[PDB]
Amino acid sequence: PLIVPYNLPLPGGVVPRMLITILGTVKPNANRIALDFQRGNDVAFHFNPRFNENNRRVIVCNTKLDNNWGREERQSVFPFESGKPFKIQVLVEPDHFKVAVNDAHLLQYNHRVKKLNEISKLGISGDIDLTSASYTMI
């Protein structure tokens, strides 16, 4: 186990068939979780479960370019629960990131940042206890 925030290096960036597995437990009374796939200062893929946006649970996904957030993609399907162990898997595919939580498909996010081999860090932050962050090739 690791104390967030934590940065997982992704040397030489990501590539299709790379499967990133984040294991942890959501804190009690959690407000937010964030994964940030970074290309330098740019965020290629921000994955942001929000436990209380306007008293609703929602997943917000976005990209940050030149320090500006772009168009949000939102999902109401919300597989996280305060206090519970989770597994987030991000599968890098040729045209999107595919996310599954607890072995159930959640969403796809099309690549806005095209230079996958420069997406060289994954930030993990928010209201979690982080057990593990690793990857393999499928």
Number of residues binding to ligand A1H2R, judged by CB under 6 A: 11
Tell me: does residue 63 bind ligand A1H2R (CB under 6 A): no
- Ligand-binding annotation for 75, yes or no, is yes
* Among 30-38, 74-82, 85-93, 109-117, the segment contacting ligand A1H2R (CB under 6 A): 30-38
Judged by beta carbon, residue 18 or residue 32, the one nearer ligand A1H2R is 32
Helix and strand numbers (H, E) in the chain are: 0, 12
Taking a C-beta distance cutoff of 8 angstroms, is the pair 65, 57 a contact?
no
- Ligand-binding annotation for 74, yes or no, is yes
Calpha distance 42→109 (Å, rounded) = 16
Near ligand A1H2R by CB under 6 A: residue from 62, 75, 108, 131 = 62
What secondary structure, in 3-state letters, does 41-68 show? CEEEEEEEEEEEECCEEEEEEEEEECCE
3-state secondary structure of 116: helix
- Ligand-binding annotation for 69, yes or no, is yes
H helix intervals, the chain? none
Judged by beta carbon, residue 96 or residue 123, the one nearer ligand A1H2R is 123
Q: Which residues are annotated as a binding site?
A: 69-75
Binding site for ligand A1H2R (CB under 6 A): 32-34, 46, 48, 60, 62, 69, 72, 125-126
